[PDB]
């Protein structure tokens, strides 16, 4: 809930992070928008 220069696993970007309610399956690391741009991520240190 602040704007940040985030980087997960080398997927660098800029944005405000938030608690999602998407259910990524165990094999999925990233969720994508209609523009092939990442709009959700699972954190690699806590699996939320």
């Amino acid at each position: 809930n602040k704007c940040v220069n985030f980087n997960f696993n080398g997927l660098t970007g800029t944005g405000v992070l938030t608690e999602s309610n998407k259910k990524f399956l165990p094999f999925q690391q990233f969720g994508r928008d209609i523009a092939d741009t990442t709009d959700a991520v699972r954190d690699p240190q806590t699996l939320e």
Binding site: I34, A35, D36, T37
Partner: protein
């Protein structure tokens, strides 16, 4: 002449309450701007 007019305004009201396609002149002008923007967002997925 008043009864025919009042009845014809009644037929307009019921016709507009019944068919969808008559306003297609306006709905198509909304659909074309929406489709043009959906296409412009999709092009952010092209590798070029």
């Amino acid at each position: 002449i008043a009864n025919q007019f009042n009845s014809a305004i009644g037929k307009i009201q019921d016709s507009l309450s019944s068919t969808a396609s008559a306003l297609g002149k306006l709905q198509d002008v909304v659909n074309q701007n929406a489709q043009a923007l959906n296409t412009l967002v999709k092009q952010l997925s092209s590798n070029f």
